[PDB]
Amino acid sequence: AEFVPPPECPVFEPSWEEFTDPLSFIGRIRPLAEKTGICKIRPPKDWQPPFACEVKSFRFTPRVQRLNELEAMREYTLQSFGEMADNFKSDYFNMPVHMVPTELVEKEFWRLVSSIEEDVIVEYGADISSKDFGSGFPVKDGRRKILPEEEEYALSGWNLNNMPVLEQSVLAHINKVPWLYVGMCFSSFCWHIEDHWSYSINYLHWGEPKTWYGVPSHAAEQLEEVMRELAPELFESQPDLLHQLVTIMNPNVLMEHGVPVYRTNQCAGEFVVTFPRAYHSGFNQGYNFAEAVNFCT
Numbered sequence: 001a002e003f004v005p006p007p008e009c010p011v012f013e014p015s016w017e018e019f020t021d022p023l024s025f026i027g028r029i030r031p032l033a034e035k036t037g038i039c040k041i042r043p044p045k046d047w048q049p050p051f052a053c054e055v056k057s058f059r060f061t062p063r064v065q066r067l068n069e070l071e072a073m074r075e076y077t078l079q080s081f082g083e084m085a086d087n088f089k090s091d092y093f094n095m096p097v098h099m100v101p102t103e104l105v106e107k108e109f110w111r112l113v114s115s116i117e118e119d120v121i122v123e124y125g126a127d128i129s130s131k132d133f134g135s136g137f138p139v140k141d142g143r144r145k146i147l148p149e150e151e152e153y154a155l156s157g158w159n160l161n162n163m164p165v166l167e168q169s170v171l172a173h174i175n176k177v178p179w180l181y182v183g184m185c186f187s188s189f190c191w192h193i194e195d196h197w198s199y200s201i202n203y204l205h206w207g208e209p210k211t212w213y214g215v216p217s218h219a220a221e222q223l224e225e226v227m228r229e230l231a232p233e234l235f236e237s238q239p240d241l242l243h244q245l246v247t248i249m250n251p252n253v254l255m256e257h258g259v260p261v262y263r264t265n266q267c268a269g270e271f272v273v274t275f276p277r278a279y280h281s282g283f284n285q286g287y288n289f290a291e292a293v294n295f296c297t
């Protein structure tokens, strides 16, 4: 009846030596991580970048998310979104936000997605460009002050602004930036893969965890087949890029049909990498702030 958590994906704790170059480290962990689709990477304890967005100006109108919309077939600052998000969660669970077990939010999320008796609606500050108010990482833009002790983070290969993003092509010889996600409890992203089957890297700057599910690329067609069988027939003929706007599916349904699924709780200061053609989806445990970019190898 209640949700059964998938097995945990790999977590890596690189030494300072291994942490020198992201692409080299990702290439070395690939034989394991590609078999789980997603992995988590914990930087060394002393690697702590400052938060570098323009907080005074940061304003956005999040999208509304009706958790049960398939089954059924306003403007905020960072501060005022946080107040709304914490009030929502503490009221929903009748306890302080940090006291709510991650497993309980997870079980309740999947219950609500399939419930026709209770219509829970949340908001997500999703797909906000780093160009609007800056990246959460420091950048040598000349647009914001960088303290000496922060320069190493502006120059780090793990700063998402410094990941390689240009794919090799003939058109490149003939002829972009990270996105931000301000989460609250139950805000979510449905199953998808990246454009061009790209890798992605995701960093949780601060706040409560982001819960992830991943499927390895060798099972991509299995997942697509389960979607074909069980996803709303009204949307069955839609191209993948549109279907993936609403590809909501409980991980246990995929697991029951033989699709390998792995989970993790990404906590503040931790990276999640998604491998090429690894389907993923997830939800936020509470008020948080993430940055993500597609990268090339």
Ligand SMILES: CN1CCC[C@@H]1CCO[C@H](c1cc2nccc(C(=O)O)c2[nH]1)c1ccccc1Cl
Pocket: 124, 126, 127, 181, 188, 189, 190, 191, 192, 193, 194, 195, 202, 210, 244, 245, 290, 292
């Ligand atoms: C146009 N393309 C095509 C592929 C996705 C990309 C657009 C961004 O799609 C959002 C998203 C993707 C994603 N991947 C990792 C983590 C998170 C996070 O929210 O933390 C993510 N959010 C998304 C997708 C579906 C439903 C809600 C939302 Cl918000």
Ligand SMILES: [Mn+2]
Pocket: 192, 193, 194, 200, 280
């Ligand atoms: Mn993604």
